[PDB]
Structure formats: C-alpha cells, structure tokens
Enzyme design. Structure first.
Site, PDB file in Angstrom:
ATOM      1  N   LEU A  43      -8.449   2.880  -7.621  1.00 39.42           N
ATOM      2  CA  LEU A  43      -7.670   1.889  -8.353  1.00 39.42           C
ATOM      3  C   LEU A  43      -7.889   0.484  -7.812  1.00 39.42           C
ATOM      4  CD1 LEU A  43      -4.517   4.057  -8.992  1.00 39.42           C
ATOM      5  CD2 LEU A  43      -6.524   3.576 -10.432  1.00 39.42           C
ATOM      6  N   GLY A  44      -8.191   0.399  -6.526  1.00 37.67           N
ATOM      7  CA  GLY A  44      -8.451  -0.887  -5.921  1.00 37.67           C
ATOM      8  C   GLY A  44      -8.452  -0.845  -4.412  1.00 37.67           C
ATOM      9  N   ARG A  45      -8.591  -2.028  -3.824  1.00 38.80           N
ATOM     10  CA  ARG A  45      -8.618  -2.201  -2.383  1.00 38.80           C
ATOM     11  C   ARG A  45      -7.485  -3.104  -1.936  1.00 38.80           C
ATOM     12  NH1 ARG A  45     -14.685  -2.693  -1.068  1.00 38.80           N
ATOM     13  NH2 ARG A  45     -15.190  -0.717  -0.021  1.00 38.80           N
ATOM     14  N   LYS A  47      -6.217  -5.170   1.785  1.00 37.63           N
ATOM     15  CA  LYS A  47      -6.851  -5.675   2.993  1.00 37.63           C
ATOM     16  C   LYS A  47      -6.888  -4.557   4.032  1.00 37.63           C
ATOM     17  CE  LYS A  47      -6.386  -9.642   5.937  1.00 37.63           C
ATOM     18  NZ  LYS A  47      -5.528 -10.762   6.424  1.00 37.63           N
ATOM     19  N   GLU A  50      -7.716   1.515   0.805  1.00 37.45           N
ATOM     20  CA  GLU A  50      -8.318   1.818  -0.486  1.00 37.45           C
ATOM     21  C   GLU A  50      -7.365   2.727  -1.250  1.00 37.45           C
ATOM     22  OE1 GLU A  50     -12.277   3.444   0.130  1.00 37.45           O
ATOM     23  OE2 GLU A  50     -13.155   1.536  -0.487  1.00 37.45           O
ATOM     24  N   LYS A  66      -3.233   6.442  -1.133  1.00 38.64           N
ATOM     25  CA  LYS A  66      -3.552   5.225  -0.398  1.00 38.64           C
ATOM     26  C   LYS A  66      -4.182   5.592   0.943  1.00 38.64           C
ATOM     27  CE  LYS A  66      -1.187   1.077   1.420  1.00 38.64           C
ATOM     28  NZ  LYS A  66       0.128   0.350   1.359  1.00 38.64           N
ATOM     29  N   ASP A 154       6.621  -8.900   1.305  1.00 38.80           N
ATOM     30  CA  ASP A 154       5.450  -9.102   0.456  1.00 38.80           C
ATOM     31  C   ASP A 154       5.817  -8.930  -1.012  1.00 38.80           C
ATOM     32  OD1 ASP A 154       2.802  -9.807   0.028  1.00 38.80           O
ATOM     33  OD2 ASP A 154       2.048  -7.757   0.304  1.00 38.80           O
TER      34      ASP A 154
HETATM   35  C1  LIG Z   1       1.744   3.758  -7.241  1.00 42.00           C
HETATM   36  O1  LIG Z   1       0.604   3.514  -8.115  1.00 42.00           O
HETATM   37  C2  LIG Z   1      -0.293   2.485  -7.711  1.00 42.00           C
HETATM   38  C3  LIG Z   1      -0.225   1.915  -6.392  1.00 42.00           C
HETATM   39  C4  LIG Z   1      -1.085   0.916  -5.976  1.00 42.00           C
HETATM   40  C5  LIG Z   1      -2.113   0.430  -6.942  1.00 42.00           C
HETATM   41  C6  LIG Z   1      -2.186   0.977  -8.236  1.00 42.00           C
HETATM   42  C7  LIG Z   1      -1.292   2.003  -8.636  1.00 42.00           C
HETATM   43  O2  LIG Z   1      -1.363   2.533  -9.877  1.00 42.00           O
HETATM   44  C8  LIG Z   1      -3.085  -0.647  -6.547  1.00 42.00           C
HETATM   45  C9  LIG Z   1      -2.960  -1.295  -5.131  1.00 42.00           C
HETATM   46  C10 LIG Z   1      -1.996  -0.780  -4.167  1.00 42.00           C
HETATM   47  C11 LIG Z   1      -1.964  -1.349  -2.952  1.00 42.00           C
HETATM   48  C12 LIG Z   1      -0.985  -0.914  -1.944  1.00 42.00           C
HETATM   49  C13 LIG Z   1      -0.054   0.130  -2.298  1.00 42.00           C
HETATM   50  O3  LIG Z   1       0.901   0.552  -1.321  1.00 42.00           O
HETATM   51  C14 LIG Z   1      -0.067   0.728  -3.570  1.00 42.00           C
HETATM   52  O4  LIG Z   1       0.891   1.750  -3.826  1.00 42.00           O
HETATM   53  C15 LIG Z   1       0.512   3.004  -3.312  1.00 42.00           C
HETATM   54  C16 LIG Z   1      -1.013   0.308  -4.563  1.00 42.00           C
HETATM   55  C17 LIG Z   1      -2.948  -2.449  -2.564  1.00 42.00           C
HETATM   56  C18 LIG Z   1      -4.079  -2.714  -3.633  1.00 42.00           C
HETATM   57  N1  LIG Z   1      -4.263  -1.702  -4.544  1.00 42.00           N
HETATM   58  C19 LIG Z   1      -5.009  -2.102  -5.425  1.00 42.00           C
END
Ligand SMILES: COc1cc2c(cc1O)cc1c3c(cc(O)c(OC)c32)CCN1C
Length: 328
Positions: A43-45, A47, A50, A66, A154
C-alpha cells in the site's frame, strides 16, 4: 530558563496506572503465526515501515500489514504497547496480531482492514455535515487516547482513514505516539510540517496532549476553507512565520514570554510584525457553504499559540459546532 508546563487534563493518568502500562521497554511481545497472513498488495512506505494489504487465511478476511523497518527495539515496543493499550477504543485502529516477518526479520503489525479513499479527493467532496461528523469522530479517538495517557503527535489527514461508504473512521500510525508524563521533556521533531504546533516550532519540549489539538485545528482550517494545507510553510522557520501572519506576532511574543522562551534569533530578519487576522478573511464564495459562526469560533479555540489555552478534546465535543451532528 523556560517555565515548566503541565497538561490541564489527564495530567496524572500514567502516574496511577500500574507501571506495566507505560513502561513499554519491559513489554514482552506475544507473537502470532506469520503463516496466517499472505501479502497481497503493497500500500505504501513510511519513513519507518512498509505497509501491505494481506489476507488472513484462517478466515479469508482482509487485513493490513505494517512491516517495521529496523528501528530501535524501544520505538517498536512503544508503538506496540500503545496499540495494545488503546485497542477497542472509539475509532482507534485495531491491532489484530503481531508476527515476525521472515524476510525483514522485524515485527510485522497486523491491523484491521480499512476501506478508505484518498483524502485529497475525499476532502474535495465533504459537505458541511460530513466535516462536522468526521471531526466529531476524530475527537472521540483523541479524547480516548488522551484519557488513556497517550498523545498521538502525528495528527494529519493521511493518518485519519475514512471508509466513507460505512461512515467509518480510524486514527492510524501510532509510531510517533508517546505516553504523557508530567514534567517530561519530549522530542520536538514530531508531526508533519504543516501540522506542527507552535510549541514545537519554538523548541518548547514540555508539551502535552494539546499538541494534537493544534494539529486538528490545522486539519479543520484546511477543510472548511478548502485550502490544502492551510499553513503552507516551506520549512520549519517559514512554518512559524505563516502562522504568525494569521495569529499575529504580538500574541506569539505573549506566548513565548509566558513560558520564558527565547525565539531563535534566525527569526529576527524573517518574522516581521503582523496583526492578528479575523477568520472571515479566508471565507469566499467557494468555501462559504462550509463556514458558519460556530465553525469559526471552534477553529479559533483550537488554533491558539498557548497550548494551555486550546480546547481539550472533551471541551471540543461540547462545542455548538457539533449540535447539528446526530449523536448515537
Ligand atoms: C489500516 O489500513 C491502512 C493503513 C496504512 C496505509 C493504508 C491502509 O489501507 C498506508 C500507510 C500507513 C502508514 C502507517 C500505518 O500505521 C498504517 O496503518 C497500519 C498505514 C505509513 C504509510 N503507509 C503508506
């Protein structure tokens, strides 16, 4: 030196919790089975991470994984403990499992799946009612974590996940979150630039939950005025100047004088002198349907230099801005 500061609410929550609650360095991680989860899409990165979409093959349910980049065991345990402490709270992202990823050899945090759509298009469509509704939902999350002795540090649109179809909201990414302890000095290098509170920008370390309320105010300003982001600084110095061009320099000086804070002399040539502005100047024909006297008064009470003067999450939920929102 600088004058000390205390949170005006939930000051002693961690003082009277058992030590195990906030002493995250001593937390023992209980590991689930990594083979329960199969990664589907990245889904993304972050800092520090991933993030992947995955399937829990024990129930064929979607989850989000995560995988933490190698950061200090202590920062990892901090996020893990905070997630476990807050689990089940209103609009707090649910940590469902923790496994050891075989490739990264680091912890992989398993979360409930949230079906969002990107905030930039979402913010583009939100109605006056939608804004008030989702603001109230964020306040539920913030009052909860504050009442549980934790500041998020944050708060920003990216960390507020909204499944608009089911009117579902989750506050995510607790990787910068901390336990509030009275008198403790904290790293000011937190939050995203546009959402950094004045306390961070003037290098005041003894801050508290009220940081999150400034950040929330920045979000609100961006939504009701349709300006992304609202305070658009090009660096951390210009960020404070942008704020001062709206809130005024005299109240900035009152703020730092109250806490006997010295402004970084870098500001001598760039800060200038600015009157406080009335919020009405940011209203125009393309955002006026999102603005009301209640909205402006609520915003005004969030965006205060003095962190001790801002509405608490609870107080904010009492505000007339939310009178029109259907309560459950
Ligand atoms: C719960 O569903 C999602 C969670 C996240 C996400 C996209 C989702 O659908 C995209 C994020 C992300 C991040 C930190 C974090 O703690 C996250 O929750 C687990 C996410 C940092 C960056 N990346 C991209």
């Amino acid at each position: 030196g600088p004058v000390p500061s205390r949170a005006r609410v939930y000051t002693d929550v961690n003082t009277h919790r058992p030590r195990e609650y906030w002493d995250y360095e001593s937390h023992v991680v209980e590991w689930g089975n990594q083979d329960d989860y199969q990664l589907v899409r990245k889904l993304g990165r972050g800092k520090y991470s991933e993030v992947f979409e995955a399937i829990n093959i024990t129930n064929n349910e979607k989850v989000v994984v995560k995988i933490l980049k190698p950061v200090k065991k202590k920062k990892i345990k901090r996020e893990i403990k905070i997630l476990e402490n807050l689990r089940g709270g209103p609009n707090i992202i649910t940590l469902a499992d923790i496994v050891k990823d075989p490739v990264s050899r680091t912890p992989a945090l398993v979360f409930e799946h949230v079906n969002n759509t990107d905030f930039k298009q979402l913010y583009q469509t939100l109605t006056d009612y939608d804004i008030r509704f989702y603001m109230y939902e964020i306040l539920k999350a913030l009052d909860y974590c504050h009442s549980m002795g934790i500041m998020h540090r944050d708060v920003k649109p990216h960390n507020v996940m909204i499944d608009h179809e089911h009117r579902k909201l989750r506050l995510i990414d607790w990787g910068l979150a901390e336990f509030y302890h009275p008198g403790q000095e904290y790293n000011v290098r937190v939050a995203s630039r546009y959402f950094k509170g004045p306390e961070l920008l003037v290098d005041y370390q003894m801050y508290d939950y009220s940081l999150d309320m400034w950040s929330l105010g920045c979000m609100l300003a961006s939504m009701i005025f349709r300006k992304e982001p609202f305070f658009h600084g090009h660096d951390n110095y210009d960020q404070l100047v942008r704020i001062a061009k709206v809130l005024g320099t005299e109240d900035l000086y009152d703020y730092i004088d109250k806490y006997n804070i010295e402004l970084d002399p870098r500001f001598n040539d760039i800060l200038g002198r600015h009157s406080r502005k009335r919020w009405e100047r940011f209203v125009h024909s393309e955002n006026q349907h999102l603005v009301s006297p209640e909205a402006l008064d609520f915003l005004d009470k969030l965006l205060r230099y003095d962190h001790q003067s801002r509405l608490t999450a609870r107080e904010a939920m009492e505000h007339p801005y939310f009178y029109t929102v259907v309560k459950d």
